[PDB]
Write the C-alpha cells for this entry.
Amino acid sequence: GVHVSYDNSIRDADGTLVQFMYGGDAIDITKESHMTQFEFCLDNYYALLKKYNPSALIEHLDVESALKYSKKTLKYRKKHSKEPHYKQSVKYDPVLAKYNPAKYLGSVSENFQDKLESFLDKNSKLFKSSDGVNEKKFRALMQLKYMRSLINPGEAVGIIASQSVGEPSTQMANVTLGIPRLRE
Amino acid sequence: PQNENARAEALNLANTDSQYLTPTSGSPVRGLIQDHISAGVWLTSKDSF
Amino acid sequence: LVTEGVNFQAMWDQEAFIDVDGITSNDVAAVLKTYGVEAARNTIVNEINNVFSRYAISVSFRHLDLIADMMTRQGTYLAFNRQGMETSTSSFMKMSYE
Amino acid sequence: YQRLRHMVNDKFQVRSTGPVNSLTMQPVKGRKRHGGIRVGEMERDALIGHGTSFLLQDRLLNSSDYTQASVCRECGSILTTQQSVPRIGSISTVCCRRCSMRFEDAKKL
Amino acid sequence: PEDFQQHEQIRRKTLKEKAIPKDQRATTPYMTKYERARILGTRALQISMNAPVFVDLEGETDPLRIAMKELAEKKIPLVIRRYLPDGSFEDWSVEELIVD
Amino acid sequence: ENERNISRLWRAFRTVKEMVKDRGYFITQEEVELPLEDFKAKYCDSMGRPQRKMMSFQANPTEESISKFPDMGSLWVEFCDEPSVGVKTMKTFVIHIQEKNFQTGIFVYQNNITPSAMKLVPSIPPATIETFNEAALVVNITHHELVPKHIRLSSDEKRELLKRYRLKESQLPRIQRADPVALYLGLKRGEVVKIIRKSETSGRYASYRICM
Amino acid sequence: RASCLFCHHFRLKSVEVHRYACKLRLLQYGLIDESYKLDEITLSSTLLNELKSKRSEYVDMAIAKALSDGRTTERGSFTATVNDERKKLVHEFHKKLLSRGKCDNCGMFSPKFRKDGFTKIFETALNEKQITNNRVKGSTYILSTEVKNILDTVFRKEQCVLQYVFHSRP
Ligand SMILES: [Zn+2]
C-alpha cells in the first residue's frame, strides 16, 4: 500500500508517512543511471539538449529560488565540515527540504550537486578546449535532467523494493549468511 | 485486456520498451543473447569486409 | 576487533583502546535498545547490504531505505511477519495474510 | 535423438468461458474441459509494481467474477436484497429484507 | 429534506476545504507517467462511445491512437484531480500540464 | 579502584553536560571539556572519592532556546551519592525541585531505585524529572557515527511541518519515548524531532519522527 | 472470568476501570498524549466521585478542545500508531482484569471457571474463607443461558466502559 503522493512523501495506503523523499533524493532508479555520468552527458550535450529541451520549461518553473538557497547552503556546507555530526550546526536544512525538486529547478540532492561541481571544476578545462559549451549551459542541463529524473508520484516502490529484494534472493568469523540471514 | 483503459496501460506503462531496466539496480534487463553476441564479434571484427 | 555476542556498555569501559564511537553490531534489536531506532535502522541497511554484497549482487539503497524506514515506522524494530503486521490499520491485508 | 512426450498439442489453452465455478462464478483449470489461467499474488503484485494497474485490476476483476448487485443503502447489506413479486399492472423491483417490515405493523399505528 | 439540505451544505464546506486554489497548486507541472496513461485510456473510451472528437481522424480506426493524436494537440477536454494523502486535492487541466 | 570509578564518573559526567548543552541549556564549552584531574580537583575532596553533591548543579536555557522554546525553564542536574535511591531521597530531591521551582530536574542514580520512588517520579507536573544510570551515561550515544543528528522542534515548527505535508500528528514515523535518544533529549510525547540522515546515495537528508 | 457475581461488576474496582473507560475513549478520538496526561489527575467514595468526575470532565474538555480545531474528526481519528496504543491498553487492561481476586466493590468472591476447547465451562467452587468473608460481607459444566444471564447483568452495569472497549471509533 505504500504511496508516494504528489508531495513526494512516501505514505502507506492509509496515509501514514514513511519517508519524506524516496531515495532521500527522490531520484527514480531506472532514470538514475547516466545522471552521475557527466562526461557522457558532456558529450552529446547538443543531443540531450534537444531531448530535455529547456526552452519550453522556463515558463512553468522556478529556476532561481532553489539556486539561491543552494549556493547559500554550499558555502556554509564547506564551512563546518570537519566537526562531528553532533557538534555540526543545523542552521539551514538541505535544499530539497524547503523546495520541491519538481516545481523548482536547481533543487537537488547535495550529493549530486557536489559531484557535478567537483566534476565541472576539475574538468572545466574541457569546457574551454572544446566547443565552449558554457558551464551554466551545462549546469542548467544536468539540473534539468536531475529534475526530470525525479520519481513519479503514485507508482509502486513498495512492490518494487519487495521485488527488488525478492528476485535477487532467488539468485542465491563465519557469520550467518544468505537468505537465512536475510530471513533473520 | 478487455478495455481501452487496460490496454492504454499495457501500451504505455507495462511494456517491453518502457521497461528496459531493473528497478533493482537500474541495470538493462534486455539485450540480444548467445548467437547475436558471437555474431557481432565476427561482424565488428576487423577481418570483416 | 570482532566481538562474538553484544554488550556495548562493556565495551564502553574499554575505550582506552577501541573507539566506542565506531562500534557497530550485527544485532539490530541490541542497537535499537542501545543507540535507538535511527542507528538500528542505519544498521539494517548496512547489514542487508552485506548479504547482497557477499553475493556480488547489487541493490540500490533506496529499496533498503524504504524497508528499513518501514520496519522502524513504529520506532521499534518490526518484522514483516504476522507479528509486526498486527498494528496495521487495514484488516483485509492482515485478514488475507496468514 | 529421442522424441519426447510433452508435445505442445498436449499443453496449451485459451479463454475459458464455460466452467464459471458455481461458488465463485470464476473459470477453472484448463486441462481439457475449457478452464482458464490462474493469476495469483506474485502475478498480482507485479501489476501493482509492474505499472499496468488499471489494466491489471480490470483484467483480474473480469477474469475472476464481476457482476453488480443490489445493496440496501440503508441496511448496508448485499444479501438481504431480493426481487419483489409484483402485481399484474406492476413491475417487479428489488427490496431489502432486513429493512422491510410486515405490512401488518403499519396499520397498527 | 432539511437533513438532506444539511449534508449538502456539509458537502460543500468539507469539499471547499479539500480544494486547492490555482495559485495554491503545489504539485509538479509535468504529467506523470501514469496520468498520461489513464487520460489516453479514459479519452479513448469516450471516443469509442461516440464522444465528440476535436481533431480529424485521418483514417484512425483505433480510438487509442486517436486519444494519442489529440494529446499531441492538447485538445483533450479532461481535468486530473490529484489527491494529496489527506484527501485535499488539486485540479490540473490537461492542457496546462506539461507532457513528458 | 576508584580510578575507573573516577574516570567513568568523569567520563559519564561529561556526557551529561554534552546532553544539557545539546538539549539547549547554557553550558560553557570548556565546562564540557573539564579534564579528569580538574574534575578530581573540583569534585573530589582529598580522598580518591568525588562528591556527587558538589557535582549536581543548575542549568539555564540559552536565548535561542528561550526564544525558540519560551516554555523552557531552568534545569536542575542531580546525582545520587547513595547507590540506593530513597523514596525520601526522591522526596528530598522532588520537593527540592518544586521548592526552588525548576522547569525540569534530572536525577542521575548510581545503580538502582526504589520503585516506590518511581511512582513518585510524576509527582509535580508540569515540572518533570529525568533519571539516568551513571553507568548508562559512560559514553554519549549521539556521538556514535550511526546515530544521526537529532533536533527537537518548536511547536511552531511542528505546525509548519504538518501544514506542509498535511498530516495528522500520528501519521509520522514514531519514535518511542523510551528511545535513548529521546531520553537523551528528554522528549515529551507529541514532540517532533528533525533527524538529519547522511545518505550514501544523497547527501545530508532531513527526516522527522514524533515522540509517543 | 473477571465478573463480580455479587457486585455484578468486574471484580476490579470501578475507579481503576474508569480510567480505561476514559483512556480508550480518548483513543477513539485518537488523542495519545492526553491519555497519559489523564493519569496526572489526583489530589472515600466522595473522593472517587470527584476523581471520576474530574477525569470525565477533563476528557470532555480535551476532546472538545481536540475537535475545536481539526485535530480530530467527529467520527474519531484513528491511525496505526493510535491502533497500536489501543491494542496496548486493551491487552494490558485485560491483565488487570484477570489479576483481581476480589470484587473491589462488594468485597465478595466469585468462584473460578474452567473452560474446554470443546466449549464446556466448569465452575469450580469457592474457597472456604471466602464464603466466610462472603457471609461476613453478605467442576460443573454451567448452562450457557446462566452465563448469558450473568453477562447481561454485567453489561447493563459495565456498558459505559465496554462501549469504548468494543469500538475503535466513537
Ligand atoms: Zn434494508
